[PDB]
Amino acid sequence: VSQVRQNYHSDCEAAVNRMLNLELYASYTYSSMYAFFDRDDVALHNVAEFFKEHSHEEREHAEKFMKYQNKRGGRVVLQDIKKPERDEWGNTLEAMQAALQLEKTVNQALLDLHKLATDKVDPHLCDFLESEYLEEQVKDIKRIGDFITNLKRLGLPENGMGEYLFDKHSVK
Amino acid sequence: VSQVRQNYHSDCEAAVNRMLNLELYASYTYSSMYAFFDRDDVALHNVAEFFKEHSHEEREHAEKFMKYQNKRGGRVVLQDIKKPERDEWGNTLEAMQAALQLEKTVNQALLDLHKLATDKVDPHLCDFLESEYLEEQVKDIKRIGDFITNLKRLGLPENGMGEYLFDKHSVK
Amino acid sequence: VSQVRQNYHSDCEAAVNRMLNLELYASYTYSSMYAFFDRDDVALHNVAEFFKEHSHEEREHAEKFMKYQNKRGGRVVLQDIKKPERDEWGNTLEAMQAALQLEKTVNQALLDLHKLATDKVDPHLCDFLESEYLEEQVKDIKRIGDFITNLKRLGLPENGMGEYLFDKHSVK
Amino acid sequence: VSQVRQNYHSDCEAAVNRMLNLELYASYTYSSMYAFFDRDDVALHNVAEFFKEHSHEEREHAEKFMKYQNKRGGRVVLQDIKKPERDEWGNTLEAMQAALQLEKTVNQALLDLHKLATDKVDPHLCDFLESEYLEEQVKDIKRIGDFITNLKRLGLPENGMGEYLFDKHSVK
Ligand SMILES: [Cu+2]
Ligand SMILES: [Cu+2]
Ligand SMILES: [Cu+2]
Ligand SMILES: [Cu+2]
Ligand SMILES: [Cu+2]
Ligand SMILES: [Cu+2]
Ligand SMILES: [Cu+2]
Ligand SMILES: [Cu+2]
Ligand SMILES: [Cu+2]
Ligand SMILES: [Cu+2]
Ligand SMILES: [Cu+2]
Ligand SMILES: [Cu+2]
Ligand SMILES: [Cu+2]
Ligand SMILES: [Cu+2]
Ligand SMILES: [Cu+2]
Ligand SMILES: [Cu+2]
Ligand SMILES: [Cu+2]
Ligand SMILES: [Cu+2]
Ligand SMILES: [Cu+2]
Ligand SMILES: [Cu+2]
Ligand SMILES: [Cu+2]
Ligand SMILES: [Cu+2]
Ligand SMILES: [Cu+2]
């Protein structure tokens, strides 16, 4: 045992390592979406940047679990970061649609980690999850849903002027 | 009853008083360690400062519990503040080890207190402990954790030179 | 073929992609080292922040290749990011030496990539490699070289006082 | 021989002269593009400025070859600047396609000149082209690529509203 460990079920230690991997997986996936929208035959730059930005955020979410792991005196165990499901993301609607899906999946991993922590009576982990992850997730989910709705209203995937307008007016 | 009290169980109220006392008693102990490292024949000024500081922090944690008790409409009942376990602390390795035991004891008590709030369904108490204590507790524990490990690497207890160096390099 | 591509050989494209992936591999390894030295029972914070830095820099080197790929009109294809080699890194010296190895390996793959660039006469790639990569590589290597030498002068692995001393005087 | 000349092959000197002229031919074609979009019946002022500016740039590239020729001890020999291919450029999409085509022609020339700098073992010329042209060229090529992609998505050449949106959103 670590000299610092207290109230940390080893089931939680191992879930954090799993969560840490999933975040990196999310990261990699967003950076694929970045490289896709920066292709000269795609060339939607602001969509590209939004995906880059989210990729940097997801990665930071992961640095933050390493830190937590150590703070509680768990041990970080790293796994292969599995490559994204596609190399080609179709267009803005399909990329936004896959992003929503990924986000909901990370949310579920998170909720499951919280529920684990409720069951093991770990109030520190419960709080860390609530304060630093859970709200961020539902903000990002509402953004992406809002994008999807607008993209559908612009007439994606078929309507290319729509996709253009979105990239010029909906992403800062 | 008090005109202000709502959803605050008697045990929660009595526990708060116990925790208030514990906090005070830890403050007192750290005061002892302060007085110990400032002795002309121990003379590690920075170690002494790091303990003066923690003695001030714990006193403030105790004040926050009095404010809490009156806010919820319970009553502050004070008990004797018990003298610390030793008048003399050995050396920085020995003191840090005693600090680590004390912080884990206090953490335990906050976990017991938290459990009691979950059992009595007092979210307001649960959130107080979560936002203001639980995290500052795990932080201080890691901190001392790290100090012990470095103190050992440095050849404590018997290497005078390592104790000198830790005092000049690991504490501000 | 891409409307933008001009003087960019298939072989180079695929080598840029493999170079990308090595850069992520290297960033992943350095974060493993950061997580190692931030452990409570290892506790060398500055050594840990140095590995954290490289991890961030190597990750940027990967992003730069992703932008290169796209600018040439080639195509980013991602692979898995193999977990690092160890979960645990012994001590500062053992970790440095493992860092020295890793930097030599990456440099070599950049030299392999420059070689290919020359044989394909592709001086835009030849120049990219020379301006943005080839010099940071030797600087990083000489610096790690310097650490390995001071580390050894100080008695590593056996001498704990010297490991400390290094953490506090050689890395900010 | 000029008293300053060293390592500068007479084939290099001649091709710098042919490069100079090409740079002016480009500049000149761009200014015709600008004059085309400034017309009251074409009236796309931002597209016009994008051209006016790239014109001013190609002209600065030529001035820079002039200076170079003299530093190495070569001798500027000027030739007619041949008028451009067209007197009207159709619409924004034709113009950008012509421009892409022009930039690849120019790029190709800069590469032939580089190739020649290698064959004739001239580092100073090799460095000049890399440092000062090649990267600019791939950058401008990439940009026009992106413009053509978006113009195609905006329904050009038949869609006027498309063309107007580009003038008002993609170009400064
Ligand atoms: Cu965040
Ligand atoms: Cu996340
Ligand atoms: Cu996310
Ligand atoms: Cu909670
Ligand atoms: Cu909770
Ligand atoms: Cu002082
Ligand atoms: Cu505090
Ligand atoms: Cu406390
Ligand atoms: Cu405390
Ligand atoms: Cu106070
Ligand atoms: Cu709670
Ligand atoms: Cu709660
Ligand atoms: Cu720091
Ligand atoms: Cu690198
Ligand atoms: Cu590096
Ligand atoms: Cu970056
Ligand atoms: Cu070169
Ligand atoms: Cu760098
Ligand atoms: Cu040019
Ligand atoms: Cu060269
Ligand atoms: Cu060259
Ligand atoms: Cu220029
Ligand atoms: Cu140009």
UniProtKB/Swiss-Prot annotation, chains A, B, C, D:
Residues binding Fe cation 2, per UniProt: E58, E103, Q137, D140
GO cellular component, one term: cytoplasm
Binding site for Fe cation 1: E23, E58, H61
Catalytic reaction equation(s): 4 Fe(2+) + O2 + 4 H(+) = 4 Fe(3+) + 2 H2O
EC number of this enzyme: 1.16.3.1
GO biological process, one term: intracellular iron ion homeostasis
Keywords for the protein's UniProt record, in alphabetical order: Iron, Iron storage, Metal-binding, Oxidoreductase
Domain Ferritin-like diiron: 6-155
Purpose of the protein: Stores iron in a soluble, non-toxic, readily available form. Important for iron homeostasis. Has ferroxidase activity. Iron is taken up in the ferrous form and deposited as ferric hydroxides after oxidation.
Similarity annotation: Belongs to the ferritin family.
Other facts noted in the record for this chain: There are three types of ferritin subunits in amphibia: L, M and H chains. M and H chains are fast mineralizing; the L chain is very slow mineralizing.
Assembly and interaction partners: Oligomer of 24 subunits. The functional molecule is roughly spherical and contains a central cavity into which the polymeric mineral iron core is deposited.
Descriptive protein name: Ferritin, middle subunit
Species of the source: Aquarana catesbeiana
